[PDB]
């Protein structure tokens, strides 16, 4: 089991203050990189790769 938000498409929200963030890609089964515009979007949105890996891979 992993949190439900791991299965969401990565969402840059509606702002343009783009910063790198990490999300889980279920199609490829790994954590990957996107640009987040800084406001809104969803919880498939991590500051580090390591964090994405520990939350959206496997059942903790």
């Amino acid at each position, epitope marked *: 089991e992993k949190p439900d938000f791991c299965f969401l*498409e990565e*969402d*840059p929200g509606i702002c343009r203050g783009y910063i*790198t963030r990490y999300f889980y890609n279920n199609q490829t089964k*790994q954590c*990957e990189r996107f*640009k987040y515009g800084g406001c809104l979007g969803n919880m498939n949105n991590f*500051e*580090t*790769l390591e964090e994405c890996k520990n939350i959206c891979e496997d059942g903790h």
Partner: antibody
Amino acid sequence: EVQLVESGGGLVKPGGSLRLSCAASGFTFSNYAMSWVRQTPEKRLEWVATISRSGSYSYFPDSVQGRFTISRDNAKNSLYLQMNSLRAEDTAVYYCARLGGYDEGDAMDSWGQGTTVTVSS
Amino acid sequence: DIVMTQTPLSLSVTPGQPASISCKSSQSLLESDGKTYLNWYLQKPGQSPQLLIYLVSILDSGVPDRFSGSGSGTDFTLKISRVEAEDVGVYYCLQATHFPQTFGGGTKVEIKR
């Protein structure tokens, strides 16, 4: 054996509009974000739009942002770049590319041969 | 935006001799996952740019092993160990660590005959 085939370029008057199409073949289209890059006559290259896999989210740089919009159709393997408010400086060849994924360092690849947009009176 | 400065503008190389092309970024390209998003393209005569190298040093499928990439932070280097006829064209760099992703101005390569 990926192929991307842009069409839709022509002359457009300044402040006018034009839609460009990209027809994709040879891979599972909805698995990839997709991009447009342009090349000016001075042969400068400039990334100008990205659409997310589902087609729900898009990115654009400040130079085109609020003038251009993008959409895709995953049942048809196509995407469309709607350009509005065209200015002299949007004259370029526009190329479609595939955003190759995290394992490919987010590089764009498989650029089409491109369609040429000319903004003139 | 990040400015990518490529030198030389052009180069002319004896066949079988090496060639080198520099790309310098105005800020470090080191990303928060520890990788570096610096890529090399080739535009061959009559063709659109094609990916040669991504993540600084990784060859794309089908790129000859004559080509290699190195560097880090702000300073990058494309090398052709022994130049051949097929390598002629304009080479560009691209960085994608920072938004918006931005190209180098290109470097034309001519081969001697």
